[PDB]
Write a protein that binds this DNA or RNA. Structure first.
Ligand SMILES: [Mg+2]
Ligand SMILES: [Mg+2]
Ligand SMILES: [Mg+2]
Ligand SMILES: [Mg+2]
Ligand SMILES: [Mg+2]
Ligand SMILES: [Mg+2]
Ligand SMILES: [Mg+2]
Ligand SMILES: [Mg+2]
Ligand SMILES: [Mg+2]
Ligand SMILES: [Mg+2]
Ligand SMILES: [Mg+2]
Ligand SMILES: [Mg+2]
Ligand SMILES: [Mg+2]
Ligand SMILES: [Mg+2]
Ligand SMILES: [Mg+2]
Ligand SMILES: [Mg+2]
Ligand SMILES: [Mg+2]
Ligand SMILES: [Mg+2]
Ligand SMILES: [Mg+2]
Ligand SMILES: [Mg+2]
Ligand SMILES: [Mg+2]
Ligand SMILES: [Mg+2]
Ligand SMILES: [Mg+2]
Ligand SMILES: [Mg+2]
Ligand SMILES: [Mg+2]
Ligand SMILES: [Mg+2]
Ligand SMILES: [Mg+2]
Ligand SMILES: [Mg+2]
Ligand SMILES: [Mg+2]
Ligand SMILES: [Mg+2]
Ligand SMILES: [Mg+2]
Ligand SMILES: [Mg+2]
Ligand SMILES: [Mg+2]
Ligand SMILES: [Mg+2]
Ligand SMILES: [Mg+2]
Ligand SMILES: [Mg+2]
Ligand SMILES: [Mg+2]
Ligand SMILES: [Mg+2]
Ligand SMILES: [Mg+2]
Ligand SMILES: [Mg+2]
Lengths: 77, 100
RNA sequence: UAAGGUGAUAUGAACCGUUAUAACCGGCGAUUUCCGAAUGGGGAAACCCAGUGUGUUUCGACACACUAUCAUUAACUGAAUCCAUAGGUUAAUGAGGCGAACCGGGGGAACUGAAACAUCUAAGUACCCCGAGGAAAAGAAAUCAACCGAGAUUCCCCCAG
RNA sequence: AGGGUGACAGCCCCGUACACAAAAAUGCACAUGCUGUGAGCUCGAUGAGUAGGGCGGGACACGUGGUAUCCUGUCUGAAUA
RNA sequence: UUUUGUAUAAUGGGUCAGCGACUUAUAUUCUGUAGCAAGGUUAACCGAAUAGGGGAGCCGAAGGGAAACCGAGUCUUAACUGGGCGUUAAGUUGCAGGGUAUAGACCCGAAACCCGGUGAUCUAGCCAUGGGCAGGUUGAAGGUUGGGUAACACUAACUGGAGGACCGAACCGACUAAUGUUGAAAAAUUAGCGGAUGACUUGUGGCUGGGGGUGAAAGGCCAAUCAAACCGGGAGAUAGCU
RNA sequence: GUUUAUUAAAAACACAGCACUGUGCAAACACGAAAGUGGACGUAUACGGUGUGACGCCUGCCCGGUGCCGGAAGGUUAAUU
RNA sequence: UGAGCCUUGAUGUGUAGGAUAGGUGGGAGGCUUUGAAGUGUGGACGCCAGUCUGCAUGGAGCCGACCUUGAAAUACCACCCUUUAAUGUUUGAUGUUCUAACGUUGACCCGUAAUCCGGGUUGCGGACAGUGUCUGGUGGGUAGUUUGACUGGGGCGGUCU
RNA sequence: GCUUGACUGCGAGCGUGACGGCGCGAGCAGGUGCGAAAGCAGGUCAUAGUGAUCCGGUGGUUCUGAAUGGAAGGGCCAUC
């Protein structure tokens, strides 16, 4: 599913609003990208489907800590 | 992304020069190819522990190497009994095996 | 608890019992085919077909038990590829499905009304979905207040159409 | 109270008021026994891709309105009694 | 019943019996009636449970002005001879009723819109696997032989057996007529008619699902239903109409 | 040959043939939030779409309009800043 | 090929003049053997006067209060207005190259007695492509709707205050 | 010829409309113009020359100003 493994960002629903304020249901999808992350503590690349925000979370927190959060949350990576 | 360089990168720095590198350069090249590691202000003291600890264990040896050359001119006189006879030939007994 | 009982349509037959294992009532047990989550594999539900291991004074064959999937954990095993990881085998624990309403969450109409209609309304209703519980949710101020003060949340009456 | 009984029964029958009852199982409460979790005092610490912002939407009675406040899909991004 | 107007040849009713349509709730206003009266009354709740408590509040006793503000006055205006609204008029809570409001809102009644399901045992197309086409005609290419050619070509006979080929049963269809039209049958029967080795036909199973399918295309077919199936739900949709 | 099962079998539909156009393969195109599937285990002598409709003689003039193709100078022109 | 910027280097003719005077403080001499003056000369400025500066030879010399002048020396310093040179660096644009993200519906290997998938190796593309958010365009492909009344029936026509 | 009464605030009382509204209006206050003065003038001989509300725009007005002071916004008068 279109779900970020780091942040949990999911598709969320909303409205497209025209100039006449006609409301048609839409979706807001996350900016998901499958990315290979180097884990220096495992000598290994880990591939995660991650939002661009999740990548910034990884840069700020470190992949070792983010993977610890995942394996606590299940989320078999 | 602030990184500390673990090695000389050509156009950036030299074995520790915290520079502002684009995150893709660091994320995908400098960290996996171990030229750098991010500057968390723990790695600015954890692998600049090589800047900190490997330097900090040198200031006390610099001071302890001064008290070792203090006992030099203390004794300076030994009972030497192997006489330089007719112009100094070694036959006697002074060093390195056994006195009882 | 008992002098009457063997459920009913529903008689009759053949019997049981009458001072305490007749029947009746209640507690705790026990038996509890096949299907069905159905779980050994399959399948046109109530059928078909196995495997392994135990045992069986005829060696024709019988009896019992186990064998699903996922998750978590552990042990043993084990690639590409040195360690390793993936993977694989076993064991242990738990889950699985059902169910009226209430509950929280994820999605989410239109008829309709506007005396047309698009904003708006209907309505976050109906409906679909996930999940839980006896209730759920909420909840211990980064809240209100107005310079006086109140003191988590929830529900009822007002405030106020 | 009520229900029956050959028509309408306080006194015919079953019941009712009232008073009694449990070998066994089980619940809600009190006390206690065991194994878990740690009260009380001292100095400290005080939840960051977060608050806030831009874009788009949603929720707040409140339709973007002069629109505070909350949520966040997207891009960003502080302070730290 | 509907109408200007119906014996009307306008509507409706075969008859009887039974059922079948102005309700309910909460607000608001007026009337009546009762209570208290410049006051009236409590709501939730408590409860000593139709009591009593509870006066939180609500309406009323003052209005004017957009408002600040003033106040039996006030607003207007720089200010009124003045003018506008007010002041000289008892309300309030029950009970009952008439109206209004919101709800299905007197009852019945659409075509339709949306949501979620069920359906390709009919039909349409496709997929796989199997079967069917009596009998009789025609006589393509090619081949053989002989002739002919420098050699090819070309030519005659014999052979050969092509074809969305011909005639015609099964089989598949459905051009015409008549019958039938409360049928024997919600599409047939009878006499004729077309195709009948093919773009044929048929059995069994399979796939495609509703704004979707499928369609040699008729808006045709998708279970006797199709310019958007069926079932259930939203739903008592709405109906200025009957 | 096909068709309005159940009032229309036809001149309608289809047809071989013709033309235009798209398509260089992860093809275009289509069904699909997507994965993927068909196209096709095919590769431009192929596939898709469109129109015309055996064959024969043929298919004339018009690019202003609408569309498509190509051009990109300049004019105008969004978010953004 | 476009702009920023600490710091230093260089841009300054009213006339008085030996002539390319922004100004205040700080002062009596700074510069010159990690190299002077007199010459040739590279690329610039230019009021055409000469300044700034690179380079080579050169080896003990350039510059003051000056006579003048509202201001007296780039004699050393310090701050800074007008002026334009230069990088580290800052972010802009086009193109080229690279690889390490990303892609691979290329090959081989393993999982694995598997044309799925994943991992690995390698090649090829490669910061493109593709995807998300935002955004202009296009958009009967699809959807929701509108398309008046009067009227000697309606429509056409006419009318509407 | 001279001038700005094509004035400001009001308005007894009337007319006309279902209503919205439209019309006529002496006279009062203030301040103007013309006339020597009486007086006349609140547009034009009269009857057509027009558009409700909403949403907003401009100017004025310390009327209001969501703790308070301001402001925003709103209201009021004028006007588009
Ligand atoms: Mg099974
Ligand atoms: Mg089984
Ligand atoms: Mg309507
Ligand atoms: Mg709406
Ligand atoms: Mg306080
Ligand atoms: Mg906040
Ligand atoms: Mg926002
Ligand atoms: Mg707001
Ligand atoms: Mg009539
Ligand atoms: Mg008559
Ligand atoms: Mg008659
Ligand atoms: Mg009639
Ligand atoms: Mg009649
Ligand atoms: Mg009748
Ligand atoms: Mg009757
Ligand atoms: Mg509608
Ligand atoms: Mg639907
Ligand atoms: Mg559905
Ligand atoms: Mg057919
Ligand atoms: Mg034939
Ligand atoms: Mg027959
Ligand atoms: Mg026949
Ligand atoms: Mg025939
Ligand atoms: Mg038609
Ligand atoms: Mg049918
Ligand atoms: Mg329909
Ligand atoms: Mg339902
Ligand atoms: Mg109805
Ligand atoms: Mg034919
Ligand atoms: Mg027909
Ligand atoms: Mg016919
Ligand atoms: Mg044609
Ligand atoms: Mg032509
Ligand atoms: Mg063009
Ligand atoms: Mg349409
Ligand atoms: Mg009409
Ligand atoms: Mg006139
Ligand atoms: Mg304030
Ligand atoms: Mg405030
Ligand atoms: Mg204002």
């Amino acid at each position: 599913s279109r779900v970020c493994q780091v942040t949990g960002k999911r598709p969320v629903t909303g409205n497209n609003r025209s100039h006449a304020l006609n409301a048609t249901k839409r979706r807001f999808l996350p900016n998901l990208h499958s990315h290979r992350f180097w884990v220096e503590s495992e000598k290994r690349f880990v591939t995660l489907r991650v939002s661009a925000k999740g990548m910034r979370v990884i840069d700020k927190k470190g992949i070792d800590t983010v993977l610890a959060e995942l394996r606590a949350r299940g989320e078999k990576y | 992304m602030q990184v500390i360089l673990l090695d000389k990168v050509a156009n950036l720095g030299s074995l520790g020069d915290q520079v502002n590198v684009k995150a893709g350069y660091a994320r995908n090249f400098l960290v996996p190819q171990g030229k750098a590691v991010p500057a968390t202000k723990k790695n600015i003291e954890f692998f600049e522990a090589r800047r900190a600890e490997l330097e900090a264990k040198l200031a006390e040896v610099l001071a302890a190497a001064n008290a070792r050359a203090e006992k030099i001119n203390a004794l300076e006189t030994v009972t030497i009994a192997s006489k330089a006879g007719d112009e100094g030939k070694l036959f006697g007994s002074i060093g390195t095996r056994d006195i009882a």
